[PDB]
Design a protein around this ligand. Structure first.
Ligand SMILES: CSc1ccc(N2CCCC2=O)cc1NC(=O)N1CCC[C@H](C(N)=O)C1
Ligand SMILES: [Zn+2]
Length: 139
């Protein structure tokens, strides 16, 4: 679990969005596993606007933060799950690191701000949905 709170927006994994997220929907994209909903309170987070490929992510299954080197956002094949059929997920960044399904929503940050959230994983892999291209989150 986990979300980004920026301005009057809440960014979550689309597969974990709540009834309230869908009732306050701003934008969603199944191909990215992202959903953004509106909030009444002002958020606590800053979004990075950069090309960093190193950062730190929070891993809830270890209660710890880990440093990572990650690939640039790209189209990556993701096997079928209870949430989605087998498909290519876009704007995904992979890295070597521990993750389990419940880790989705953990934030990845670089020195500039929030880069993205945990969205996929594998045997010693962790994948993050990028949010740096969503310029409208800042306005
Ligand atoms: C952090 S998610 C994760 C982490 C570890 C694993 N494991 C750990 C060992 C074997 C294995 O595959 C499996 C996942 N699940 C996973 O990637 N998905 C399920 C939720 C929806 C995701 C999507 N964006 O399509 C895909
Ligand atoms: Zn950065």
């Amino acid at each position: 679990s986990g979300a980004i709170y920026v301005g009057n927006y809440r960014v979550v994994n689309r597969h974990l969005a709540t009834h309230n997220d869908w009732a306050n929907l701003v934008w969603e994209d199944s191909s990215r596993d992202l959903l953004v909903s509106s909030t009444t309170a002002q958020g606590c987070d800053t979004i990075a606007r950069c090309d960093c490929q190193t950062g730190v992510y929070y891993c809830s299954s270890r209660r710890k933060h880990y440093p990572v080197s990650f690939s640039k956002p790209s189209l990556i094949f993701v096997e079928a799950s209870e949430y989605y059929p087998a498909r290519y997920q876009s704007h995904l960044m992979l890295a070597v690191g521990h993750s389990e399904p419940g880790d989705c929503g953990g934030i990845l940050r670089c020195q500039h701000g929030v880069v993205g959230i945990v969205s996929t994983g594998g045997n010693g892999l962790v994948g993050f949905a990028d949010v740096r291209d969503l310029l409208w989150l800042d306005e």
